[PDB]
Amino acid sequence: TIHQHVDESQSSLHHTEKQIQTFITQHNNSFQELDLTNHHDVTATKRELLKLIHQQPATLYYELSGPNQFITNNYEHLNTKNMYLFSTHQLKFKNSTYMLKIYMANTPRLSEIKKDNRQFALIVDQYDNILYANDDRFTIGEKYRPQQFGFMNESVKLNHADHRLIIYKD
Amino acid sequence: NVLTVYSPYQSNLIRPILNEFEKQEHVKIEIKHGSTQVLLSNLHNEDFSERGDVFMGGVLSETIDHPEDFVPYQDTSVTQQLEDYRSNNKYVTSFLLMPTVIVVNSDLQGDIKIRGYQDLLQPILKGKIAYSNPNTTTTGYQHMRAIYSMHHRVSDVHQFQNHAMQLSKTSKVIEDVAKGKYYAGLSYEQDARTWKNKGYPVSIVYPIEGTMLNVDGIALVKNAHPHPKRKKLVQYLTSRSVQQRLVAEFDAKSIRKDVSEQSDQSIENLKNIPLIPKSKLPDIPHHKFLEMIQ
């Protein structure tokens, strides 16, 4: 049912965001020792980021951006605008400051309930902007309006920001 | 009261940073977008009562044709900025440094040498390179200044314009070079890396004859009721932590001394880029330099 699918995804997304923050906290001192102009330290950083990515259920892509430097596991160059921006961190490395953004493209739960149960997912802010959608009926960026299409839905508040996860079904 | 910002930067590049200022200062920031010259022109034709508060971004020290539209302001923390790029201009605060570049298609280049502007004049590249309209884009304007700075000859500009295709938009230059329509093009580092980062075969060249460095600025707009948070926004955008994020996201260089790069080896250090000598940089008003090359 929808209610049992909305609370599991909220709790899973709640847990994943915690693991990201914990990762950051525990890698603070290590990052300050890593010079990202040195290829050994770049490899060490990629190893830690890819380790974190695959410890999470969801499909996540990282973008580590610095001065004239771009490090990512988005090897197919998927458009991040169609993903959910899920954490942002300003990190001090040995050589410069880098911005780390983590995007959510899908989760094994949301992709399964969409295939098996035809239950789709939306993520909207308190301003009602669409921040994620696995349904083409809806367009990222535009506003959410439940009535127009009016499906049986159930929403919860996401833990890390003023966002709401909405799972619906026709 | 809503704080209104004019900005030639794309919305998605500055909105997250302005959102943090919104939370820090409990204010809402509305953004007006467009090219630098169009924003300036529409601002000049706005009454005193409907004008915004801050102009954020663009080569303001080189493009502002109406200084009476802006308020003189110099924060006391200007001593934290690089001396060579501190604004010599009462109504502009220097903000970010952006190198202009030649972008080269690495699939097409082969053995053709492209180190600067004079390599672009090779017969094998005639009609196969592109630039943006200097009358409507600051990128094309800055590149024509760099070409003019080579020998202080207007004829050098005209010879280049008889060799390279002129496009209406700066963004079309990098797009068409990256997609293989042109061998090379005149762009800027941030635009080049944007397409390089999504897999396109583009190389970045600092013109060896002299590399024009864009000094983007921030200016307070003269209006009837200035928003009291606007000076805090200028200080926020020029702060040390915000400049560190901007350098990482914009592929720019910081205006601050404590953020700038000084490690001798690295290319991100300004001293490793062949910049135009200060004595040669054209000190001509924006409207007059355009008149010279028309």
Side-chain angles (χ1 to χ4, degrees), chain A residues 106-121:
Chain A
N106 61 73
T107 78
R109 224 183 291 270
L110 294 180
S111 98
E112 155 194 87
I113 65 173
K114 166 185 171 179
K115 163 169 200 241
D116 289 346
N117 300 146
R118 291 289 174 229
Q119 301 183 23
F120 299 84

Side-chain angles (χ1 to χ4, degrees), chain A residues 9-10 13-14 83-86 104-107 110 120-135 138-144 154-168:
Chain A
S9 281
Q10 185 276 346
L13 294 170
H14 173 43
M83 303 176 185
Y84 174 61
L85 179 55
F86 177 80
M104 187 274 289
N106 61 73
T107 78
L110 294 180
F120 299 84
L122 271 163
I123 293 188
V124 298
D125 55 359
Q126 84 272 58
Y127 312 131
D128 267 25
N129 295 326
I130 293 183
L131 306 178
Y132 179 81
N134 55 7
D135 181 359
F138 293 101
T139 301
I140 196 97
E142 332 205 320
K143 288 249 138 52
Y144 174 58
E154 260 179 282
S155 65
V156 293
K157 194 243 171 214
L158 290 187
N159 182 263
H160 69 286
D162 297 304
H163 299 163
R164 290 164 290 142
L165 165 67
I166 316 155
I167 296 182
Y168 54 94

